[PDB]
Design a protein around this ligand. Structure first.
Ligand SMILES: *[C@@H]1O[C@H](CO)[C@@H](O)[C@H](O)[C@H]1NC(C)=O
Ligand SMILES: *[C@@H]1O[C@H](CO)[C@@H](O)[C@H](O)[C@H]1NC(C)=O
Ligand SMILES: *[C@@H]1O[C@H](CO)[C@@H](O)[C@H](O)[C@H]1NC(C)=O
Ligand SMILES: *[C@@H]1O[C@H](CO)[C@@H](O)[C@H](O)[C@H]1NC(C)=O
Ligand SMILES: *[C@@H]1O[C@H](CO)[C@@H](O)[C@H](O)[C@H]1NC(C)=O
Ligand SMILES: *[C@@H]1O[C@H](CO)[C@@H](O)[C@H](O)[C@H]1NC(C)=O
Ligand SMILES: *[C@@H]1O[C@H](CO)[C@@H](O)[C@H](O)[C@H]1NC(C)=O
Ligand SMILES: *[C@@H]1O[C@H](CO)[C@@H](O)[C@H](O)[C@H]1NC(C)=O
Ligand SMILES: *[C@@H]1O[C@H](CO)[C@@H](O)[C@H](O)[C@H]1NC(C)=O
Lengths: 170, 114, 107, 125, 48, 170, 170, 125, 114, 125, 114
């Protein structure tokens, strides 16, 4: 049938990478992964996660007593202070996790966008955008031509006189 | 300050009987992404070190299926299903959890044929 | 026949930390944490009383070292380490609650 | 694959500079590590450099007297260790990540996979 | 003219954080335990 | 030689502004700065920095004593409370600085993007994107033509019949 | 006269939605609203506002006394602790409101952008961007044609041979 | 408009599954609610489902024994209530938002506007 | 735990005299966006419930101008300007402020012709 | 360059309105300031207006009885001071930033560079 | 509440001998971007004020090299390398650190030929 890109849905057949390609020509179909955009997305998330596994050096000692209870007026100032600080660290934990979930989702959504305008400026006038995340190449691009878009070695002037006859005239 | 402690510090083996090298950590080596940052190395006499296990349990490229890795948290074991004559040398464990402390190696474990 | 668009750069920039990366080269940076101070009690526009050899609670009872501070008036009271409250030996009861009263008292 | 420079004999107080030419790397955004092995003793991690930016992370033992640079046009890394002593007699390895591996778990690996042949440095009189 | 005092002098700055004394009194900057926190005032540097 | 734009690297010859232009035609080369995009980037950073130089009006007084030490059980409640609050202001300072470094870097990276689609919609069909941050103009654009892209006075219909012969036919 | 889009200004005649269209053809003018982009913007703001109307379950009781005053040294530890916590919740409130005002403004500015590249990939080669937020359609698009861009039923191949004669040749 | 499935007679311990075909919806990003009305008693809200993602929000009374799914190709919603008792004898309504309303205030409405005809479920022996 | 309490729990009306049904909340139903999340429903005997007011004060599509909604905060009143014979049945109030608690209904108010 | 309106004589209780036509500005995103100089006394800053948005920042002395507007089509700024007294007798200057300066340090300048000729306002009986 | 205090409040000068006007602040005028927000103005009798120094140390456009600006923090000095007969009038210092407080001017310094 037909193939669609990242605008419609995500592929469940991509297992060796986060972002990848999928071509369709006369030789058949094909699916590859993008190692440079997957590694760039993971390097920002474990760097984000390296910020959270660093432990404090401030040692807190014991001021209450679980066996022999402290005096009641000093036992209520300690209890009121500890619940005040607990509200702060429960707010800051729930705020930080919810904020870094917005940043994680948005950074992986901008790596797929950055891969999209990289291919779009490679295929300068030889391809048109479908609207679902795919490019309609207007020349006979075989299996090593499709490899040239994948590894950033495409030359648009090799097919420029051929793909322009198929766009404005045919 | 993660301190790696290896054992049994020497291991005379027989070519056909399994072996096991353990390396226990001071702090937990389990990251937030769910991986244990422990690497197993083999350095033969006169050569560069060879990577064997790279994330606690995952075998490298040119490593046979004799070498296995298990363990999680602080306690880790390297496991050889059967020993050949090409498996002698010194085995180091190496943690890579946090880089501003740095990466540190184990003490080593000499393995010779008995 | 072409036209480009670019941003400026320097040879060596400053390394700052970001949310997902440590040591990003930015062009310029500044310090947010203060470490240098002025090693004096700069108090223009205030009415400063410097006790010195006298203690804060002594001015209530009046030992010989607190003779000129018995009716003092201040916007800022500076206590020194060598200040003593008593001449005959003794001490106050709830002395730290009384010190927080006269520090706030204005005279 | 990595290829280092030859052996060097130095005097206490001088500075040694080792080369490491990473030949065949199309990513050049991994981490390259320099480690150290004294004769008799074990391996000893010195530092780590990013070929994209140049951000280094030395050990606390080797802090101050290690400078690591690179020249990405010729794809060559350097390591300079100043104020040498007799205990700097060792073999100096440069190592990095292999690349072109089709596992998902290999993206979370930041250690040493492919190694150099070693550089013997002797400091005596 | 000073506004934030401690046992060794006076803190006069426009910076919002300080690392001099925990027990500074008056209208003081907030005491932090870090001694350097660099704030970027420019763009990211990509050299030629 | 050849010139490249903001996608590859940043120019160390731009000293009177943050963003600028660089043209190449028959008369020679040239380099100018953009004052409207530089001022817009700096107005958001000093406005960000004006938020941090406003000092509190809450006066904190002395409850300990450096000379004559307080009672030990009240000397430990004060010491435990002050270390709790110090953890909060050391976390909030390190979080705010690291968060506003992500915002400073990203706002100056979107001002260069906004300058790029401003020129792209000026040169409607008379220029093509190179892929490095430059536009390949397909008509003879001299030194006052290149000034017209810089100051937002370009008219694409003056060169539309000339630059279309050079694109689809030649 | 002439009509402009979201790049220049915002329309004060749009009252049933946040984002909308405005066409101009031989039959006359017209103004419609976009219900799918307005609902998507409001669903992210009331979801943002649902995060702030959830009240704590921590009960704080009385430790001071408004009638008979407490002892002075314990009356100053309570007063110093309560002003410390008040600085934290006055900082976190002013930080959260100022941060979610940057997010509210930017999410409603990206919904107008997402509506712009949705129409841009519909009119593939039949329209050109004006630069103010409008598309210059190069074929005779009547009042039901203009409805087809609005409800995502446009087919570019129906007018592709007609709108290409008007672009490269005329 | 919504059209539900017919009446069903069950036994205590079985599971009932009700259908609700939303015919004529071009948004499909609203909220669809299932409510309940025992004979004699009043209305009782069960849960709410998002047809875009599938995120459900059940009541605390109906938590654990309610599973709501949908099939957006045929535009059909489902609700399965396991471990039936005699007090589950009721009429089951599916309701959602109407759409194509030209008021600004209707964007802030997340309740029930258009309703189904009801599904009588009887649990006896 | 928002609890809706309706009143007067029954209302015998005359076809030509106005009626009024009140439903007071336990907690405030006023969101941060400035709307009161209270819905007024009418269920006739044998039919599905019909929406009348959908945000405290706004009339629905197929509802005549007899039915009016007022109130804010916790106290709310439904108001009928004149009663016809087609306005019998049970009137429920329903709040929709927070969904992880859930949506809850009122007790009901039977309205019959006197 | 800025050109103001002529002199005006008012009575205590009326309102004075001064004009300031910024002729030759292609940025129109700077800050325009109104200051005041009583005869004998020194300069006195009144307020500041943003021609992009219209956001004003008055002084605390002139808060409540000053309204500053602009008309960006004709490029003309206004300042209206209500409830006049005898001490409002002064010369009223409008000033702003010059522009077209090729220094990097001039981007961090938000004060007054180019000035108007002044407007003498006399309040008596 | 930043208060500017100028000195020496009058300065009789000789055309050929240098002069110096100081203006000290109450609070620090140093922003986070590293600039001192102090402006030096000259108003002749009958004319508009003329900008001389605009960020503590930077000369304006139509200002000769006689006028120099130095100082940082709270203490600032204007410096004239040699005085001409066209350098009479009143010199004001003006701070622009924070706008919700506002911009304030100094008291002035009359400079006449002795
Ligand atoms: C303080 O809270 C603890 C609970 O952790 C409780 O056991 C103790 O009795 C409380 N103290 C007082 C004085 O109420
Ligand atoms: C890119 O792929 C093409 C076709 O497979 C190949 O000829 C070329 O050598 C590749 N270039 C690089 C740098 O891998
Ligand atoms: C999620 O992470 C865990 C541990 O990091 C891993 O085992 C698993 O394969 C990952 N993916 C999924 C889909 O669970
Ligand atoms: C509280 O901490 C201070 C350090 O600032 C120390 O000098 C003092 O002895 C401590 N008090 C007690 C009771 O331990
Ligand atoms: C823009 O530049 C062109 C060429 O230099 C000039 O003719 C035109 O007057 C300029 N327009 C403006 C508004 O500066
Ligand atoms: C603590 O602050 C309150 C103000 O809420 C004041 O009334 C009380 O006197 C203060 N206590 C002491 C001991 O100063
Ligand atoms: C879209 O609009 C066109 C023209 O008004 C109409 O023919 C078509 O049926 C519409 N499609 C949908 C899905 O509303
Ligand atoms: C703003 O919100 C209020 C209440 O939510 C509403 O009444 C009003 O119409 C809205 N719009 C404006 C422009 O005030
Ligand atoms: C950075 O800022 C300082 C002070 O704001 C300035 O002197 C310097 O020129 C700026 N640029 C660089 C590259 O240091």
């Amino acid at each position: 049938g037909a193939i669609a890109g990242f605008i419609e849905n995500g592929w469940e057949g991509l297992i060796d990478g986060w972002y990848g390609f999928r071509h369709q020509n006369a030789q058949g179909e094909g699916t590859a992964a993008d190692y440079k955009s997957t590694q760039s997305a993971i390097d920002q998330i474990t760097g984000k996660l390296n910020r959270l596994i660093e432990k404090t050096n401030q040692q807190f000692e014991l001021i209450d007593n679980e066996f022999t209870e402290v005096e009641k007026q000093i036992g209520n100032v300690i209890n009121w202070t500890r619940d005040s600080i607990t509200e702060v660290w429960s707010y800051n934990a729930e705020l930080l996790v919810a904020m870094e979930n917005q940043h994680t989702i948005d950074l992986a959504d901008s790596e797929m966008d950055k891969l999209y305008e990289r291919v779009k400026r490679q295929l300068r006038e030889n391809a048109e955008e479908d609207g679902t995340g795919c490019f309609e190449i207007f020349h006979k691009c075989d299996d090593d031509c499709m490899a040239s878009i994948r590894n950033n070695t495409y030359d648009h002037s090799k097919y420029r006189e051929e793909a322009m006859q198929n766009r404005i005239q045919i | 300050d993660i301190v790696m402690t290896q054992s049994p510090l020497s291991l005379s083996v027989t070519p056909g009987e399994p072996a096991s090298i353990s390396c226990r950590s001071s702090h937990s080596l389990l990251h937030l992404n769910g991986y244990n940052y422990l690497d197993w190395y083999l350095q033969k006499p006169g050569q560069s070190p060879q990577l064997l296990i790279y994330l606690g349990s995952n075998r490298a490229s040119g490593v046979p299926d004799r070498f296995s890795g298990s363990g999680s948290g602080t306690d880790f074991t390297l496991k050889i299903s059967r020993v050949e004559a090409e498996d002698v040398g010194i085995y180091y464990c190496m943690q890579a959890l946090r880089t501003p402390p740095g990466l540190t190696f184990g003490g080593g474990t000499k393995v010779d044929i008995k | 026949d072409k036209i480009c668009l670019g941003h400026h750069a320097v040879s060596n920039g400053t390394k700052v930390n970001t949310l997902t990366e440590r040591g990003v080269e930015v062009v310029n940076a500044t310090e947010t944490v203060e470490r240098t101070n002025i090693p004096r009690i700069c108090s223009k526009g205030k009415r400063t009383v410097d006790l010195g050899q006298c203690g804060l609670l002594g001015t209530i009872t009046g030992p010989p070292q607190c003779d000129q501070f018995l009716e003092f008036s201040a916007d800022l009271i500076i206590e020194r380490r060598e200040g003593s409250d008593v001449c005959y030996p003794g001490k106050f009861v709830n002395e730290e609650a009384l010190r927080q009263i006269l520090r706030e008292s204005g005279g | 694959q990595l290829v280092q420079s030859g052996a060097e004999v130095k005097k206490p107080g001088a500075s040694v500079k080792v080369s490491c030419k990473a030949s065949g790397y199309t990513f050049t955004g991994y981490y390259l590590h320099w480690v150290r092995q004294a004769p008799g003793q074990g391996l000893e991690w010195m530092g780590r450099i990013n070929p994209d930016t140049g951000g280094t992370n030395y050990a606390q033992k080797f802090q101050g007297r290690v400078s690591m640079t690179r020249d990405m046009s010729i794809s060559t890394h350097y390591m300079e260790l100043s104020r040498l002593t007799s205990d700097d007699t060792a073999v100096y390895y440069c190592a990095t990540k292999r690349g072109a591996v089709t596992a998902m778990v290999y993206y979370y690996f930041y250690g040493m996979d492919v190694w150099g042949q070693g550089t013997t440095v002797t400091v005596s009189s | 003219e000073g506004d934030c005092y401690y046992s060794g002098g006076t803190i006069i700055s426009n910076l919002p954080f300080q690392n001099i004394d925990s027990r500074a009194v008056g209208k003081c900057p907030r005491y932090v335990k870090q001694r350097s926190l660099l704030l970027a005032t420019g763009m990211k540097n990509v050299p030629e």
